[PDB]
Amino acid sequence: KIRTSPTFRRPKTLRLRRQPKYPRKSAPRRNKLDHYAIIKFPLTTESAMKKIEDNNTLVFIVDVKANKHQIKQAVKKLYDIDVAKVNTLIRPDGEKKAYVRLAPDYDALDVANKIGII
Amino acid sequence: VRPKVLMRLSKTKKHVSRAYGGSMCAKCVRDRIKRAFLIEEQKIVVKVLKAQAQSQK
Amino acid sequence: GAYKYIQELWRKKQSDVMRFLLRVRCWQYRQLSALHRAPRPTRPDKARRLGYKAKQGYVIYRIRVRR
Amino acid sequence: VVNPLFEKRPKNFGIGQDIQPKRDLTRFVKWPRYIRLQRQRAILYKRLKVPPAINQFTQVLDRQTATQLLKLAHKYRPETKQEKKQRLLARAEKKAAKRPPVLRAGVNTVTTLVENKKAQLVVIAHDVDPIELVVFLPALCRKMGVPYCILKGKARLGRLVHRKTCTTVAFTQVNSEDKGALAKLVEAIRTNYNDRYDEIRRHWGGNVLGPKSVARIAKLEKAKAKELATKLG
Amino acid sequence: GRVIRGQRKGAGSVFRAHVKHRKGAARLRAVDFAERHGYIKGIVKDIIHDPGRGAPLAKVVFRDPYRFKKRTELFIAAEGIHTGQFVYCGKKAQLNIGNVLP
RNA sequence: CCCGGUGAGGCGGGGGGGCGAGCCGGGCUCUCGCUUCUGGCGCCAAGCGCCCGGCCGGCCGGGCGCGACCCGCUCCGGGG
RNA sequence: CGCCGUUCCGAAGGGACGGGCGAUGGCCUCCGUUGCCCUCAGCCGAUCGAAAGGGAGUCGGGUUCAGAUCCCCGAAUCCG
Ligand SMILES: [Mg+2]
Ligand SMILES: [Mg+2]
Numbered sequence: 001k002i003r004t005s006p007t008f009r010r011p012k013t014l015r016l017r018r019q020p021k022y023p024r025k026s027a028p029r030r031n032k033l034d035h036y037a038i039i040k041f042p043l044t045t046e047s048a049m050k051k052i053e054d055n056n057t058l059v060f061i062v063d064v065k066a067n068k069h070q071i072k073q074a075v076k077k078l079y080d081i082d083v084a085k086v087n088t089l090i091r092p093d094g095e096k097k098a099y100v101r102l103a104p105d106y107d108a109l110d111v112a113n114k115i116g117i118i
Numbered sequence: 119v120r121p122k123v124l125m126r127l128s129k130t131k132k133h134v135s136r137a138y139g140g141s142m143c144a145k146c147v148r149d150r151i152k153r154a155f156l157i158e159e160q161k162i163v164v165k166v167l168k169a170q171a172q173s174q175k
Numbered sequence: 176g177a178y179k180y181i182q183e184l185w186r187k188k189q190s191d192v193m194r195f196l197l198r199v200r201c202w203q204y205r206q207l208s209a210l211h212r213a214p215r216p217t218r219p220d221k222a223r224r225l226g227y228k229a230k231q232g233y234v235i236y237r238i239r240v241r242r
Numbered sequence: 243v244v245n246p247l248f249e250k251r252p253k254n255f256g257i258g259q260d261i262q263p264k265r266d267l268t269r270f271v272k273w274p275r276y277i278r279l280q281r282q283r284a285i286l287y288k289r290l291k292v293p294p295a296i297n298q299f300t301q302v303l304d305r306q307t308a309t310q311l312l313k314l315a316h317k318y319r320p321e322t323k324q325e326k327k328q329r330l331l332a333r334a335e336k337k338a339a340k341r342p343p344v345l346r347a348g349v350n351t352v353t354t355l356v357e358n359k360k361a362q363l364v365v366i367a368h369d370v371d372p373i374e375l376v377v378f379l380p381a382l383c384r385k386m387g388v389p390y391c392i393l394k395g396k397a398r399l400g401r402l403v404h405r406k407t408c409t410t411v412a413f414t415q416v417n418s419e420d421k422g423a424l425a426k427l428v429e430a431i432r433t434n435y436n437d438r439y440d441e442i443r444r445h446w447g448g449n450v451l452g453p454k455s456v457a458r459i460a461k462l463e464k465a466k467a468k469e470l471a472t473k474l475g
Numbered sequence: 476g477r478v479i480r481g482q483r484k485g486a487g488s489v490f491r492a493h494v495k496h497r498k499g500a501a502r503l504r505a506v507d508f509a510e511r512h513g514y515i516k517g518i519v520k521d522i523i524h525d526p527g528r529g530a531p532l533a534k535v536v537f538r539d540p541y542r543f544k545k546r547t548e549l550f551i552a553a554e555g556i557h558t559g560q561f562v563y564c565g566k567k568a569q570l571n572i573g574n575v576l577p
Numbered sequence: 578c579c580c581g582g583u584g585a586g587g588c589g590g591g592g593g594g595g596c597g598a599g600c601c602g603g604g605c606u607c608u609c610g611c612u613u614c615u616g617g618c619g620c621c622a623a624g625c626g627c628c629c630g631g632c633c634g635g636c637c638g639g640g641c642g643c644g645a646c647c648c649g650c651u652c653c654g655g656g657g
Numbered sequence: 658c659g660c661c662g663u664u665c666c667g668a669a670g671g672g673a674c675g676g677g678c679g680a681u682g683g684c685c686u687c688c689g690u691u692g693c694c695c696u697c698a699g700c701c702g703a704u705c706g707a708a709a710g711g712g713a714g715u716c717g718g719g720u721u722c723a724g725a726u727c728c729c730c731g732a733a734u735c736c737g
Contacts, residue, residue: 542620543620
């Protein structure tokens with residue numbers, strides 16, 4: 001009716017949500033970072049054995065794109081174990097190493113036997 | 119304390135139990151209470167004189 | 176036969192009628208941006224004899240070039 | 243009985259004093275460029291000198307005449323698409339076992355009719371843009387002796403022919419039951435447009451300053467005429 | 476020959492103003508209804524030093540006549556003004572040092 | 578066409594009101610538009626009028642108008 | 658090819674307390690969500706720009722061939 005400000009502003013107008021006639025992609029893309037992809041193989045070095053025996057920690061080489069949440073979910077699902085925390089460093093050769101500490105009720109040396117590490 | 123530390127302090131530590139407390143010093147709050155009251159009184163006085171001269175006019 | 180009169184009318188650019196229309200329209204064109212979508216041909220007779228047709232898929236643009 | 247707690251608390255809106263009220267500022271708004279451009283084009287037409295060939299289109303039918311003219315024309319509207327399909331289907335039924343009069347739309351159709359003297363009344367919209375499409379038509383209709391009138395709205399002529407817009411329409415024939423209605427229109431229209439043509443084409447438009455300027459001129463003259471009046475006292 | 480120093484000054488580059496620590500542009504109030512028909516009151520909050528300028532600047536605060544706001548203006552300090560002083564601007568301010576009149 | 582300012586915020590004209598003047602209570606030359614003592618406060622309406630609704634003339638809740646004059650063609654100024 | 662320009666010729670806000678309407682839900686009691694409408698909104702310049710500027714919050718003991726305020730033991734803390 002009346003303008004109590006000297007400024008004109010673009011009036012707000014309806015914005016409809018997208019309703020595609022067809023999907024631009026026939027099917028969704030397959031998850032290429034599944035549990036099997038995340039965990040490459042276990043590390044069996046001398047420093048890795050020490051972690052198993054003394055820190056209740058498993059030492060895995062993982063995909064460089066994995067994060068600590070995904071690694072934890074992968075280790076639990078693959079081996080039906082529990083994880084206390086996951087530490088990660090990217091090695092000078094470009095591989096990501098995961099220091100997976102298991103829950104206190106899980107014996108890492110026992111679990112390593114299941115995984116075949118030892 | 120540093121400004122972001124003020125977020126985790128209770129309110130009692132960041133102010134004073136008085137009008138403007140934590141924002142204006144007591145000395146200047148005294149001056150404002152008088153200044154507000156005394157100027158408002160002056161308005162009434164001039165209003166009566168202005169009204170009187172209007173009556174006398 | 177209206178397109179004939181318009182063609183002949185636009186040949187009298189120094190007439191009083193045309194001078195008024197060119198003057199005001201140049202003023203209006205000068206208040207817009209250098210490239211400007213136009214809603215319809217300013218000159219329906221001239222546009223069509225240059226190949227334009229009044230159907231979807233033909234669009235008009237007004238361009239301002241420095242002299 | 244009134245509650246004594248209620249009282250007047252008037253605001254003093256003088257310079258200084260209280261903040262100003264949110265009064266109507268429509269006159270001082272900064273409007274979008276396109277609003278300024280279309281408004282400034284309306285003042286230029288008033289401000290400048292509009293040649294008679296264009297200015298004539300400002301003279302238009304009064305509302306009473308246009309309503310009668312549009313009521314009569316509404317009896318001769320061209321058939322819609324939906325009902326032309328019906329006529330063809332009925333023509334098939336009539337086949338398996340005269341053209342009524344109608345309006346004529348468009349400056350191209352109407353111009354050719356006017357040159358052939360096949361039009362009895364031509365109606366021209368007053369706001370065709372570009373004006374070249376019709377700026378010549380009034381001068382043509384007078385030359386051929388066709389009565390013509392200028393009506394408000396190329397969109398009101400649009401509603402006649404079921405289109406957004408129409409530059410001009412023309413009566414070529416009417417049913418015998420309407421000849422009297424057309425006859426009265428033609429006689430009223432002709433005296434306003436065809437007969438005054440000598441004066442229409444010598445009548446420029448615009449050339450009117452703005453109210454602030456006019457008031458400034460008047461106030462200056464009002465200082466001399468008063469000075470003149472007090473010359474004798 | 477090569478471009479002389481005077482020519483090189485107009486290109487900016489190393490010849491632009493040292494405005495890192497300048498307090499702002501010094502201006503009067505934008506003229507509005509209050510100054511056109513009456514006057515408006517302000518208060519000198521501080522008189523400050525502006526780098527690169529000999530004259531001090533005054534920081535005068537007004538009320539916004541249409542909004543609940545305080546307007547901070549940066550004036551050129553007239554000699555003799557002081558903090559806490561009242562200055563007035565408009566067609567009907569009095570003739571006193573620091574006032575702003577047509 | 579150009580320049581300046583603004584968050585383009587009260588511009589032009591008229592109405593309405595006030596102090597003065599002076600022609601014989603009214604008209605008009607003609608003026609003004611409510612802030613100058615103090616380093617306070619100051620918005621998101623009070624009030625008045627008119628209608629509407631809900632529950633049971635009483636309670637509860639809305640809308641509108643004045644308050645905040647009317648009409649105007651360039652935002653207001655400066656050039657041109 | 659592009660350059661200038663950074664608020665300058667721009668309809669530059671996609672936000673919200675609250676109020677009114679519907680549609681949906683669930684620990685269907687009443688609360689949420691969602692869509693529309695009413696109302697309110699300066700910021701006025703996208704974005705980038707510092708491993709020495711600004712910037713919440715971790716310390717002690719042990720431990721390796723090579724890593725530790727990062728691992729282990731212990732005791733804290735900030736933010737959400
Ligand atoms: Mg305290
Ligand atoms: Mg840094």
